[PDB]
């Protein structure tokens, strides 16, 4: 049976099919008849079983798909781990697991505790080390203290000698004299009397010890080469090609460093996500999330209420915490807004807007004493009287 | 409690709002600035910081 | 044409209150037996009356 | 002829609504008087309704507990403004002309405002974002667009009080009080079409109706008197309120009539207006709170709502319900899954009520004739009328003559009624199931095994609620939606959750083991007790020395499987790859090999299933476990549900009668270890705890490299706890090598049943690391963390490394690093339990309302569609394979193997 | 040169006609204000010619269908 014949009877029959699952029973399909050899009656017989299958596993009407969301959601955090680790890891970076993380991301805080940016590479430098660290250094976000092997903050006669390390240097790719330059043109009202591989510094005659600590912390944390918000970079490579991990957060920024592949470039914080590649975007990276923040903790949870999740929460354009700030808060039903509040200004806004309540919800139709519109709640039934 | 500024107060129950601290010293009838310096050390960056 | 099973639920609810109301049985059932498994075997021969309407 | 509300709109009353609506005008400030009898023209009058025993309503004719009470309206003598609606009066002010009435805004404003307004309608935040950023724009404009006439300031003050700042003719600024009857004529003539954009609707909400002209008056059953325990009647705060309104409003009126000075008119005016509010609400802002006779501030029609116990946040509560018992489990699996074993005692107290039929009229009288004391009775009979009476002794002999067709009986629970089943707390939906009765002597609720996992229950004092439906449709749902048989396969991950658990495995792999065989007597046995439907045994599979016939463990098995089941996959106990290669290479190359070729290639590490016959492979945790059920999976999606409960019915009790008539133990000596094997862990302790001494070296002579996230001291503590958690790894991995399989520990721990590979390392090798919070020990003494070593030590063993095992037995320092640690995990056990329902809670309050339509739309409460086509395929997690939507590979393979044997 | 439809987690979008969008909206039985809406100041719509009131046909990639239409409108 050639192959266009099985794609044929694939489209004749199973018109109704999803489109993957069409093109993964083509393929499943092309490797077993090559393999043993099918006729005509199998494959009509397998298509019109898969079609009976996906008929059976349609969802009925009325099923209550939010309830059970939420708590297929809740029921394993129970078992989840409650933060109260410190995984300390040698080629990673610290981040926040568990219940914490999805606290955070349904309640979508503004900023997250550990901003964590995933930044590829494009072809030029992914299968290369040193490419990859050039990269680095383009994204380091390099600080004096990294750089300086020790400090020696020494007030008692106003000085300030910092011994820098040859090896951070060389690493990240700048040179005494191109940080010194650097540093005066950015501390202009400033002396550096650089000597060998100490930096010296003078706050331009200041008296005071706290105000030189000052000026010597300013200098010390001072960004040389960089994009802003950015710490420590670890440079991995998984699978073949090099990948970039970075803390901090400057998605948009990123984006436009040379040898960064915009693509397939990623971020922890799901508003700057927003921010810059529309809503969309956003409702993918917070399904992914949730879904790896499940799955790091070995549970397993069906995708679809995480999508479901995902879609109630960015439904007018802007993503908003699904708690009573953003969406319970703003519930039509003022019967049930009603009993989640301390005021009566609600009552007197709806009576002056003329607001509708269409007895949609459960908390309403639960408080009048009528059934719930869900599942048998939601069936009509006749009878034809003459009787046998 | 030490100020991000560098500025001591001290914070008494009654008082609703807080006290520099040379005040509060000169209140008790320490009044010399050296003595206020004296009862707190002799360590030069601490009298400077006073 | 497949009933949901919500709507199996309401069906058989609605046979077996009219059942216990006093309406006859359609099928002969055995003896001692309270209505609601009256209904259920009912169902299970396929003798319903009741009929639901879809929007 | 019963209809259910379907939607609720609210509005403003109109005055002539009220006026209309209402029955007795009223005018006399008179109580309950002195004989208890409603006087006319008062608070109370007989027209608004009677609570009052021994006396009809004036208008409906009821008595008091059937008359649901009647509306009354005062004719006020002046406009007042309601509390509520003063913010609303003043935006409105300030956005339309002092001569006109209408909006001070552009034409073309008015068109876009009307567009975004039709688009944002649902959304109410943004609808109040518009509203507000329209009365701001029509507020900051000064000469009205239509008129040209000049609009002086309008000043707001608390909390009914309106000034103009007007200015004279000398240019100063002077405030001039807005009377209500001003702000009456200022909002009468705003046109209809304004008022969307002003945010009202000209239908339901008038401006002109938020001052009020006729304040209506609540039924008596409204503000009831509860009377006091010395028989004063105990008025409602209410019915003060009112009687200080009609004091007031008389008073007014006729100091009205009598061409009063202005002044005296005013002071009266605002009385009423200050009474008015605070019998609205008396916790308005700026309002002086009423005091009762007391001395106490009087709660008000506002005070009565938003109280978190009265109609809103309080009707919606927990409270003891009716037909309902509670009562420590105890377990036993010779019951049905779906069966649940209920004490008599509670069994002959919740009665459950039956309508007598004609086919069972003669059960019913028996039961009846038993009374209330032998168990197959009844308690209580009610006659067709509708009295309902006591069994007893008395009138047992009769009741039963008389029992006919109509009559209801509520007689005891007996076997085969339906009940529900529920564990708290309840987290997941299968928290609550539906049982089938079978009574049996003793106080405990009797639960099957298998029904453990999904209601997460122990047998250690645990205690469980039962609910007893009563009404034919509740018993009808809870038999058909509620049921266990329909809930096997969570709707989590689309997996089984009942299944298996601790005996049902390891009993499982020891009738399946290679090289097991059973006698005839115990195939007999075993076969009759499962309760399997077999009565001629199958031929012998090797002979014993002497001669009596002998059946591997494997064909008993297979004599519970399907006639076509087929199914092929790796268990746990894969330790040898080649073995399941080889097979698999078969089986691919042939999809039905010759079960003689099988038999040489067998290993208990594949499973291999043909035609219902166990060829090759052993049961674990794979088999029929709490997830990755495979078998119980496919006979739950393949032959339905009746057929899975009975194979599941089975499986248990042949497995219990081989775990207990083979059995099973666990003593001291399943963790004793070889000499060689602990010569092994001795020295990779002390290579480890010597290389952690060399790290410790070369940090304090300052040879250390800081990594760029951790200083030096955080670079030397995460290098240390890597070589501990190594060397933890590797003294457990010797002693799984050198524990047996025969050992039965470790096939608890290898079959999935019981346990892990952790335990056995922590129980017989070595304990490892202790840490706090993913840190090692330090909270202590002055730099060390007890009093026994030297200060300022980081060595392995001062820092929470445990070497023995508990075996060999803790040294005090060791034992207390342990205790730190199980505090540790005992405080993170008991917060993780509020946060996770606090967090529950949330996404249940903001997901409850969603459900699917009839056309496979999802939409929100309000009427916006959250999604097409839910979960973007259509598809039931439960009905879904283990997430995928068809798992087209087993289609193929099942029906190839159907139609090519 | 980087447009965000390259992006993975950009699923493509489109702007429909008159006919389509009434013949949508019959579909479902809905209005436009029942409709999930985006922004006007999203980049997906500054990178199309959208303007508010307009209906945004989404082509996402599903995990569990492949193919999956989405419909927003655009508001201020
Ligand atoms: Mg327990
Ligand atoms: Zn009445
Ligand atoms: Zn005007």
Redesign the interface.
Known sequence: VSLSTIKSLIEKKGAN?????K???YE??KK?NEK?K?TK??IE??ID??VK??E???????????????????????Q???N???????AE??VTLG?PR??EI?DARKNPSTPMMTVYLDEEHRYDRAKAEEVARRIEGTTLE?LARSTTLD??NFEFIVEIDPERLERSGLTMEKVVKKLESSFKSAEFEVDGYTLIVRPKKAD???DLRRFAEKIKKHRLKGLSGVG?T?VRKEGDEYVIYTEGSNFKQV?KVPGVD?????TNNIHE?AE??????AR??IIDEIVSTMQEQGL??????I???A??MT????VRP???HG??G???????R????????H??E??????????????EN???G??V????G???????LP?? | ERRKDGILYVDIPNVPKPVKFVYVMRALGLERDKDIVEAVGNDPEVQQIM | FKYTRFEKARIIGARALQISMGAPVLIDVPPGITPLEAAILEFEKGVIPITVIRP | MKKVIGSIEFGILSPQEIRKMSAVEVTVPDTYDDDGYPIEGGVMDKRMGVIDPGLRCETCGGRAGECPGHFGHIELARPVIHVGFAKTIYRILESTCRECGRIKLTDEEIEEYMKKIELARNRRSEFNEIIKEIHKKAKERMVCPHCGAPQYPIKFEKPTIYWEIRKDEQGNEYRHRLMPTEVRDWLEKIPDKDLPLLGLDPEKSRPEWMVLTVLPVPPVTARPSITLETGIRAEDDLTHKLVDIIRINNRLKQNIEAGAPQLIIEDLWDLLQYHVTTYINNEAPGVPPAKHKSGRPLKTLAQRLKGKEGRFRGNLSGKRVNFSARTVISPDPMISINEVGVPVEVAMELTVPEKVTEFNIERLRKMVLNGPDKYPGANYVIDPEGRRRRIMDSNKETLANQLDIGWTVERHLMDGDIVLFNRQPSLHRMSIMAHRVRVMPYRTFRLNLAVCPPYNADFDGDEMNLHVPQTEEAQAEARILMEVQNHIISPRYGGPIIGGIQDHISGGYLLTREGAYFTRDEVEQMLMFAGVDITELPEPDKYDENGNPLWSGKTIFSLLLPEDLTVWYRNKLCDEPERCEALEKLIEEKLMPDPEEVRKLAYDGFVYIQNGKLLSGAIDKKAYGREDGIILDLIVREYGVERARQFLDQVTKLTIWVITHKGFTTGIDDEDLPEEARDRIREIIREAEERVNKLIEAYKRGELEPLPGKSLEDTLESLIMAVLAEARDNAGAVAEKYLGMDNHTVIMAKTGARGKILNITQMAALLGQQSIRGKRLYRGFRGRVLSHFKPGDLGARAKGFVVNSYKSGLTPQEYFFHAMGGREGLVDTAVRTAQSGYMQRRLINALQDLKVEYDGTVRSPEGIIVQFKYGEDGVDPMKSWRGKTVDVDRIIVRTLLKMRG | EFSIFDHVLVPEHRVLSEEEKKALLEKYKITLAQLPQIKASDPAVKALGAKPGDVIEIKRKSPTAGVYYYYRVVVE
């Open positions: 099919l999803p489109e993957n699952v093109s993964e029973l499943k399909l077993y043993y099918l009656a199998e017989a397998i079983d898969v299958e996906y059976r596993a349609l969802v009925e009407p009325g099923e209550p798909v939010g309830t059970v969301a939420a708590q297929s959601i809740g029921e394993p955090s129970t989840m781990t409650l109260t680790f410190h995984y300390a890891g040698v970076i610290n219940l999805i606290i349904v990294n007030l008692i005071k010890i706290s420590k670890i984006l915009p693509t397939r470039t990623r996500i810059v590649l529309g809503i969309e975007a993918n990276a397993e949870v069906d995708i679809r209420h999508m479901l999740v879609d109630m439904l007018d354009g802007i699904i708690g009573r969406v319970v703003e519930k039509s039903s003022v019967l049930a009603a009993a989640f509040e301390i005021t009566v200004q009552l007197f709806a009576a002056e807007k003329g607001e509708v309540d269409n007895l949609n919800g459960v908390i639960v408080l009048i009528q059934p519109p869900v599942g048998t939601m069936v009509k039934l006749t009878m034809k009787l046998r």
